[PDB]
Amino acid sequence: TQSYTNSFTRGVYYPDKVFRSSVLHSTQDLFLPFFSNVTWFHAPVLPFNDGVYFASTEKSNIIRGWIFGTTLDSKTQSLLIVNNATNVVIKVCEFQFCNDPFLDVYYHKNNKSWMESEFRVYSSANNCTFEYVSQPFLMNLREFVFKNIDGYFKIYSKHTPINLPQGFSALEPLVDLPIGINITRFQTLLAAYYVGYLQPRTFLLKYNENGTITDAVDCALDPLSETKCTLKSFTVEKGIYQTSN
């Protein structure tokens, strides 16, 4: 299932660790384009080009874990992320064979809702380098953006309650794990997917007095946004303005 939907100003994250109060900043980094189209996934390997935007909402904890890699073979190192009930394990260890993802013949939650101690997806645990354990990543709508720039793998997260809904929610950094591996493909795991891809765009964020982003404008959507970015302001007065060439 690849039903398409538009992203209404979703996928904004803090670019740096610095703090700014009551000032508009223009930055040129990877971002999800405003009003771009995303793909819903239901019950395949994604191309994972220049970052990714992951979002999912549900009242259960069915969704957990991700796998990254460029070949998923013994030739090249592969990465894993899996969340437990009380912890998370992130080990960049090679995996050779994947016969089939685990799937119960019944998988009915109307009678039995217990699915425990049934996780075995790695056929061979070869030599590897890094392993990180911390507080659970997941807890409402969950939004994650994964990047791989200069050998650093960065993960952002945010929990936005809903009643991709409209609004602005900034993604705060979570864990900058230094794997060093090349990533060209990714895939989600089970026990309602929003997938979007980033481009090297330029933005103009608005910083609150407390230091949080409230609004942003994409400098390549419509001529009004280009005028706003040129003037470095969110309100434009009457007149004629030169924007580009």
**Which residues contact another protein by CB under 8 A?**
14, 17-21, 23, 129-130, 172-173, 178, 210-212
Taking CB within 5 to 8 Å according to partner kind, which of another protein, ligand NAG, none is near residue 84? ligand NAG
Task: Indicate the residue among 18 and 240 with the shorter CB distance to another protein.
Answer: 18
Should residue 6 be labelled a site residue for ligand NAG when binding is judged by CB under 6 A? yes
- Does residue 197 contact residue 50 with C-beta atoms inside 8 Å? yes
Backbone angles phi, psi at 134, to 5 degrees: -155, -165
Nearest-CA neighbor of 236 among 244, 245, 224?
224
Question: Which residue among 21, 22, 71, 84 contacts ligand NAG (CB under 6 A)?
Answer: 84
- Does residue 80 contact residue 90 with C-beta atoms inside 8 Å? yes
- Does residue 63 contact residue 192 with C-beta atoms inside 8 Å? yes
Residue 114's Cβ-count burial label (10 Å; 0-12, 13-18, 19+) is exposed
Q: State the nearest-atom distance from the C-beta of 145 to another protein, in Å.
A: 15
Should residue 150 be labelled a site residue for ligand NAG when binding is judged by CB under 6 A? no
- Sign for the CA dihedral angle at 191, 166, 206, 219 comes to positive
Structure tokens at 21: 């109060």
Question: Which residue among 1, 3, 4, 116 contacts ligand NAG (CB under 6 A)?
Answer: 4
Taking CB within 5 to 8 Å according to partner kind, which of ligand NAG, another protein, none is near residue 208? ligand NAG
Question: Nearest 5 degrees, angle CA 10-CA 11-CA 17?
Answer: 135
Task: Indicate the residue among 165 and 211 with the shorter CB distance to another protein.
Answer: 211
User: Per-residue x/- marks for ligand NAG, 29-48, CB under 6 A?
Assistant: --------x-----------
Site residues for ligand NAG per CB under 6 A: 4, 6, 37, 74, 84, 87, 89, 94, 119, 126-127, 181-182, 208, 210
